[PDB]
Amino acid sequence: GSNFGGGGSYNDFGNYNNQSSNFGPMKGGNFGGRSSGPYGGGGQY
Amino acid sequence: GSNFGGGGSYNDFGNYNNQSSNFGPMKGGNFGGRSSGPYGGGGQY
Amino acid sequence: GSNFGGGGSYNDFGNYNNQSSNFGPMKGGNFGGRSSGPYGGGGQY
Amino acid sequence: GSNFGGGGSYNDFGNYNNQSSNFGPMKGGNFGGRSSGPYGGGGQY
Amino acid sequence: GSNFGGGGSYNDFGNYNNQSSNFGPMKGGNFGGRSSGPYGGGGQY
Amino acid sequence: GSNFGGGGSYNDFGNYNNQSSNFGPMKGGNFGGRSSGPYGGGGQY
């Protein structure tokens, strides 16, 4: 009779995948991670 | 008689995939991750 | 009769993956990690 | 004047994605990965 | 004048993703990884 | 004039991702890793 996150629970558990494979000179950017903030995610800025 | 996230639960659990493969000079950007904020996601800015 | 994060729990447990493979001169950036802050994520700035 | 995998190169770099989301009792199987061998891919056997 | 894997190179660099999200009793299997061998991939056997 | 794995090189560098998120009783299996051998990949056997 268990209660797995019932009621008013905010259950957020997804799978987020980011993959970039490359053969050659790589100067750009590959951006992943959750980044839950304003202007989040490391970049150039 | 279990309750898997019943009631008023906000159950959000999807699979989000981002893939970029490339042969050659890569200078652009591949953008993944959840990025749940204003101007979220690392970029150039 | 256990209660796994029921009630008003904020249960956030996803899988976030960032992968970048590359053959050659790599000068750009690959950005992962959670980065839960303003301008979060190490970059160039 | 670069040569990105020219000549007799076997250049194989695709993006293969497998996603299965489900709400409820999950007893079956979701099968991904490359599995480049005879009877490859973990299963029941 | 660089040679990124030219000639008779076997250049194999793809992105293979396997994702399975589930709400509830999970008894089955989610199978990923490369598994480059006979009967490869962990299963039940 | 660099030679990044040219000639008869076997260049194998992909990104293989396996993700399984689950809310509830988890008794099954999630199978990842490369597992480059016969009957490879930890399972039940």
Author numbering:
A (entry chain E), B (entry chain D), C (entry chain F), D (entry chain A), E (entry chain B), F (entry chain C): 251 to 295
From the paper:
In this work, we determine the atomic structure of amyloid fibril formed by hnRNPA1 LC domain by cryo-electron microscopy (cryoEM). Recombinant hnRNPA1 LC (residues 186–320) was incubated at 16 °C for 2 days to form amyloid fibrils. We then performed helical reconstruction by Relion21 and obtained the three-dimensioanl (3D) density map of the hnRNPA1 LC fibril to an overall resolution of 2.8 Å. The density map showed two protofilaments intertwining along an approximate twofold screw axis to form a left-handed helix with a width of ~7 nm and a half pitch of ~45 nm. The helical twist and rise between neighboring hnRNPA1 LC subunits are 179.05° and 2.37 Å, respectively. Based on the high-resolution cryoEM density map, we were able to unambiguously build an atomic structure model for hnRNPA1 LC fibril. Despite that the fibrils were formed by hnRNPA1 residues 186–320, only residues 251–295 were involved in the fibril core. The structure reveals that the fibril core is mainly formed and stabilized by PY-NLS. The serpentine fold of hnRNPA1 fibril core remarkably contains a single but long β-strand composed of residues 260–273. β-Strands of the same protofilament form a parallel β-sheet with a kink at 263FG264. In the steric zipper, the opposing polar side chains of N265, N267, Q269, and S271 are tightly interdigitated to each other via van der Waals forces to form a shape complimentary dry interface, which is reminiscent of the first atomic structure of steric zipper formed by segment GNNQQNY of yeast prion Sup35. Thus, the binding of PY-NLS with Kapβ2 can directly prevent it from driving the amyloid fibril formation of hnRNPA1, which provides structural understanding for the chaperone activity of Kapβ2 in the inhibition and disaggregation of hnRNPA1 fibril formation.
